[PDB]
Amino acid sequence: IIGDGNVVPVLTKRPSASIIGELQNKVDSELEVGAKNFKTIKAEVGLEFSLETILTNPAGILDIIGEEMSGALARQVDAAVIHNRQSSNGAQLTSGTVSITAGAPTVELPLTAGVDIDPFLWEGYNTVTEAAGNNFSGFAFDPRLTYVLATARDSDGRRLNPDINMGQTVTSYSGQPAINSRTVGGDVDAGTDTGIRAIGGDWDALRFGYAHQIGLRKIEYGDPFGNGDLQRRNAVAYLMEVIFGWVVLDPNAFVVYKLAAE
Amino acid sequence: RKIEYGDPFGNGDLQRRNAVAYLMEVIFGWVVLDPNAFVVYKLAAE
Amino acid sequence: LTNPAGILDIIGEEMSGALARQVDAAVIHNRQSSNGAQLTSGTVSITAGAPTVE
Amino acid sequence: IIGDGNVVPVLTKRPSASIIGELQNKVDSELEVGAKNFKTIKAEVGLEFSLETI
Amino acid sequence: ATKSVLQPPAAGSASIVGGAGGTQLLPKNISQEWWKKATEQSIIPTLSKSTPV
């Protein structure tokens, strides 16, 4: 729902049984609930065309703007939730939302060429499951991680990570599911490369949804984007926007794998 | 009347701000044919 | 989209009454009801130039 | 309901009209809500008798 | 300890909603019926001679 009123109940203390003898006193136990809450934010994308462009329709461009706009929104959802970024200029969001990368523990990957990073993916799994105590459910990989894994070789020149396939979008690593996307490195739209190369964790500790969606909407009046009035300029605007929210139910349910400093 | 477009109140464009305006209006007129046809009763000062 | 307590359901009657209150405020007192200030318009109210009984 | 979560919405500001000329700029008014909340309390009475007193 | 839901928690008890942020779990009932004054009627259209305008 729109606003800060989205609440998830979290079981903070759990009951513990005991062994009770013949005619020994039965005992009552701990139980406690907390909550996490989250705000929605809004992503919008807009395009504006002269009437001549609308009537011309070059190569059927108006038939693909809905796909390109809904795609731009989907990349802004990833950029907000993962990196706390605006897609259109790569700046930090000043909204009150918390990204997966904000306050998640990090594993520093070696920057050196041909060094094997496979040990570090286990150090992060151990960080989520032993130290923080969560489940583990999969990875998001940047495609540059998959190349650095697949090109790690021993002193005889044999691959250290031979099961890693080339360029595959949906994969598994050590039996955990793994999704490749450049939204993990974050050099997408106007973003810079963050040096992030994987995120691993309990992906059920991230809840996500849409409060509201506005599909491709044609606007014919006023000045919706600051270019000038649409009737005065003989122009048409297209808008698409989405109101969405997420919660990371434990910051330590995720680990971020990131390159070292230069 | 609901209004979804333009800037009807000087706050900024409604589509640009993602806002909706409502408006209502009346045009009316009257004449007082003699000021002295009326008397006003006021409370005194403190 | 929120409609906080059904507040958007009353705006038609609230705005109907706002106009009615401004008819009285103009004709009786020569004032803008949103501001309380005197109207700059060329109209004359009942209270303008009527005699007062205290 | 039990606890301090009983809530009543309170209308706190209302629209008021303006007077405007032929091509003078129209203006928005105001509309605002608050709320009051209240808690519950518990009253009890009881009596105890021996079986012989029943 | 027995589980409390009212705040502050009763003595010798534990709060069921005692976890971080847990009070956001306590229900609200918002009345459909508002507290609002009636507004003043306009008298001028009643208290005057009607004319074509």
Determine the length of chain E.
53
Q: Is the dihedral of CA A217, A220, A222, A223 positive or negative?
A: positive
Residue A240 sits at the vertex; the CA angle it makes with A239 and A244, to the nearest 5 degrees, is 140
Answer yes or no: are the C-beta atoms of A12 and A34 closer than 8 Å.
yes
Distance between D34 CA and the closest CA of chain C, angstroms: 10
Residue of chain A whose alpha carbon sits nearest to that of E3: A31
Do residues A73 and A241 make contact, with C-beta atoms less than 8 angstroms apart? yes
Contacts of D7 in chain E (CB under 8 A): 28-31
Residues A157 and A257 in one domain: yes
How was this one solved?
A: cryo-EM
Chain C residue numbers with beta carbons less than 8 Å from the beta carbon of E39 are 17, 21
A200 & A210 share domain: no
Distance separating alpha carbons of residues C9 and B39, to the nearest angstrom: 41
In angstroms, rounded to a whole number, what is the distance separating the alpha carbons of residues C48 and C42?
12
My answer on whether A5 and A126 are in the same domain is no
**Taking the CB of residue A125, how many other CB atoms lie within 10 A of it?**
19
Same domain, A27 and A107: no
Residues A118 and A83 in one domain: no
Instruction: Determine the Cα–Cα distance for residues A251 and B24; give it in Å rounded to an integer.
Output: 51
Give the total number of structural domains in chain A. Answer: 2
Edge-to-edge, what's the strand order for the sheet holding D6-13?
D32-38, D6-13, E29-30
| Domain span holding position A187 | 103-204+250-262
Whether the link from the prior residue into A110 is cis, omega within 30° of 0, is no
The answer to whether D27 faces chain B, any CB pair under 8 Å, is yes
**In 3D, which of A34, A8, A30 has the Cα closest to residue A18?**
A30
Length of chain B: 46
Based on the fold, state whether residues A69 and A96 are members of the same structural domain: yes
Give the long-range contacts of residues A72-76, CB within 8 A, separation 24 or more.
A72/A45, A72/A189, A73/A43, A73/A44, A73/A45, A73/A240, A73/A241, A73/A242, A75/A183, A75/A188, A75/A189, A76/A43, A76/A45, A76/A189
Number of residues that make up chain C: 54
Cβ(D12)–Cβ(E37) under 8 Å?
A: no
Q: Does residue C53 sit in helix, strand or coil?
A: strand
Query: What is the CA A247 to chain-centroid distance, rounded?
Result: 11
Q: Report whether A71 contacts A65 (CB < 8 A).
A: no
Comparing CA positions, the residue from A244, A256, A176 lying closest to residue A209 is A244
> What's A184's DSSP letter?
T
Sequence-separated (6 or more) residues with CB below 8 Å from residue A179: A138, A139, A140, A141, A169, A170, A171
Please report the beta strands in chain A, taking only residues with DSSP state E, as ranges in sequence order.
6-13, 32-38, 40-50, 106-109, 138-141, 170-173, 176-180, 196-201, 206-219, 235-248, 254-259
Is the distance from CB of A73 to CB of A43 less than 8 angstroms?
A: yes
- Burial class from Cβ neighbours inside 10 Å (0-12, 13-18, 19+) for residue A244 reads buried
Q: How far apart are CA A148 and CA A170, in angstroms?
A: 17
Dist. CA D18–CA D27, nearest whole Å: 8
Mark whether D and B touch (3+ CB pairs within 8 Å).
Answer: yes
- The answer to whether B39 and C51 have CB atoms below 8 angstroms apart is yes
**CA–CA distance, A65 with A76 (Å, rounded to integer):** 16
Contact predicate D51/C22, CB 8 Å: no
A92 and A22 part of one domain: yes
> Do A2 and A211 meet the contact criterion of CB atoms below 8 Å apart?
yes
- Chains C and A physically touch (3 or more Cβ atom pairs below 8 Å): yes
Min Cα separation B29/chain E (Å): 7
**Resolution as reported, in Å:** 2.6
Quick one: A159 and A49 in the same domain?
Answer: no
- In this structure, are strands E3-4 and E14-15 parallel, antiparallel, or unpaired? parallel
Shared domain for A14 and A93, answered yes or no, is yes
Sequence letter at residue E30: I
- Which residue has 């009607």 as its token pair? E50
* A46 and A92 belong to one structural domain: yes
Please, which contacts does A145-154 make with residues 24 or more away whose CB atoms are closer than 8 Å?
A: A145/A117, A145/A184, A145/A197, A145/A198, A145/A257, A146/A171, A146/A180, A148/A109, A148/A117, A148/A197, A149/A116, A149/A117, A149/A118, A151/A114, A152/A114, A152/A115, A152/A116, A152/A117, A152/A118, A153/A114
Sequence-ordered list of residues with C-beta below 8 angstroms from that of D18, at least 6 positions apart, any chain: C22, C32, C33, C34, C35, D26, D27, D29
Give the residue from E24, E26, E30 with the most A CB atoms within 10 Å of its CB, the best one to mutate: E24
Distances in whole angstroms, Cα of residue A176 to Cα of each of A116, A171, A173, A179, A253: 19, 9, 5, 10, 15
Residues A64 and A140 in one domain: no
| Same domain (yes/no): A96, A128 | no
Instruction: Give the pairing of strands B2-3 and D6-13.
Output: unpaired
| Among the listed residues A216, A222, A221, A230, the one whose alpha carbon sits nearest the alpha carbon of residue A49 | A230
CA B3 to chain centre: 17
Spell out the residues 6+ positions from residue D15 whose beta carbon is closer than 8 angstroms to its own: C11, C14, C15, C18, D29, D30, D31
- Are the C-beta atoms of residues A40 and A2 closer than 8 Å to each other? yes
